[PDB]
C-alpha cells in the first residue's frame, strides 16, 4: 500500500495540497527487504513489464572483490560491524548497501598462497621462478596483514540485496580502511 508520489506532501511553501488522485499503480512502493545472514532465501517479485526483482531475505554467501589485487571470490559473511545509516541495523545484523560486514577471507588466503606464495600470519623450479617474479610487491601495509592473520576481513557491500538478491561487495583498502577502523576503535 506504500505510495511514492509527492501529491501527499506539503507544498514547498508549506501549503497542504488537496487530494487530487487516488493512489496510482505507477507510483507504488514495497516493503523493505531486511535481508539477513544464513539460509539463503530469494523471493522473486514481478514488476512493471515483467522485470523480475530478486528480494533477498536471509542471504548466506556473497561475491567480494579485492580491487587492488584485482580478484573476486565467493565468501560467507560473519556479520555487520558499522552502518552509516543506522546502528539498529548493525545490532540486527541485517544487510543493506554500503554496510560493513566481516568475511572469513579463506578463499582470499588461498588465492594469495596460490598466486604469490607468501605466508600470512604465523615445488617446481618454474613455478618458484614465477612466484619470485610476482613477488617483491607483497608489502602493501600492516593492517591488511593483521586482518589476514585474524582471519576476518572488513568489507563493504556495494550491491542492493533487496533489488538483486546478491550481497556483492568489496574489501576496504586505503583511506576507507583508515577511516572505518578509527571509527570502530573510537569509543
Amino acid at each position: 500500500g506504500i505510495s511514492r508520489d509527492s501529491r501527499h506532501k506539503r507544498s514547498a511553501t508549506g501549503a497542504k495540497r488537496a487530494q487530487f488522485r487516488k493512489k496510482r499503480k505507477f507510483e507504488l512502493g514495497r516493503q523493505p527487504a531486511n535481508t539477513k545472514i544464513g539460509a539463503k532465501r530469494i523471493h522473486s517479485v514481478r514488476t512493471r513489464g515483467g522485470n523480475k526483482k530478486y528480494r533477498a531475505l536471509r542471504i548466506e554467501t556473497g561475491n567480494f572483490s579485492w580491487a587492488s589485487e584485482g580478484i573476486s571470490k565467493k565468501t560467507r559473511i560473519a556479520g555487520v560491524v558499522y552502518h552509516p545509516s543506522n546502528n539498529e541495523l548493525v545490532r540486527t545484523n541485517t544487510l543493506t548497501k554500503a554496510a560493513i560486514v566481516q568475511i572469513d577471507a579463506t578463499p582470499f588466503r588461498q588465492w594469495f598462497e596460490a598466486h604469490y606464495g607468501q605466508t600470512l600470519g604465523k615445488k617446481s623450479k618454474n613455478a618458484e621462478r614465477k612466484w619470485a617474479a610476482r613477488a617483491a610487491s607483497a608489502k602493501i601495509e600492516s593492517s591488511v596483514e593483521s586482518q589476514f592473520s585474524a582471519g576476518r576481513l572488513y568489507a563493504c557491500i556495494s550491491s542492493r540485496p533487496g533489488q538483486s538478491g546478491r550481497c556483492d561487495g568489496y574489501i576496504l583498502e586505503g583511506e576507507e580502511l583508515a577511516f572505518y577502523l578509527r571509527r570502530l576503535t573510537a569509543k
Partner: protein
Amino acid sequence: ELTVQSERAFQKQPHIFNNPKVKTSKRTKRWYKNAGLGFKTPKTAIEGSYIDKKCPFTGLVSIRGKILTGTVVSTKMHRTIVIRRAYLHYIPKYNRYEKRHKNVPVHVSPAFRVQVGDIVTVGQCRPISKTVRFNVVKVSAA
C-alpha cells in the same frame, strides 16, 4: 566544510579507485568533468578535496535544459541556496507591467564561494531534492 570525512559514511566519488601500490606525487585521484555549454570548470573544482556527489563538475549530475540567473537571497542552507528571479509580468488590459519574482532553490557546489547579494547563474539538472533542480555554474558578483 573544513573536513571532508565529518559524516558517518565515507565520502568518496564512486568508481574512482586510487591504487595504493605507487608512492609518488598526487597519491589520490579526483574525478571532474566539463559541464559543457561554455562554462569553465574552476580550478577549485579541479583540485579540491570535497566530494559533493551533486556537483556539476566533480559530481554525477549532468546540466541540461534551462539556464537561469539571479541574485541569491538565502545562503543559510547546506550546499544549496535560493536565488531571487525578478521579472516584469505584462498585463494587456492596463498596457503595463508589474514587478513579480520567484524564489527558486539551487544547489551550490563547494567549488564556488557565494554570499548574500551575489549574482549567480544556474543550469537545470535532474531533481536533486524536493525543490532543488538547478546547479550553480558561475558567480558573477563580489
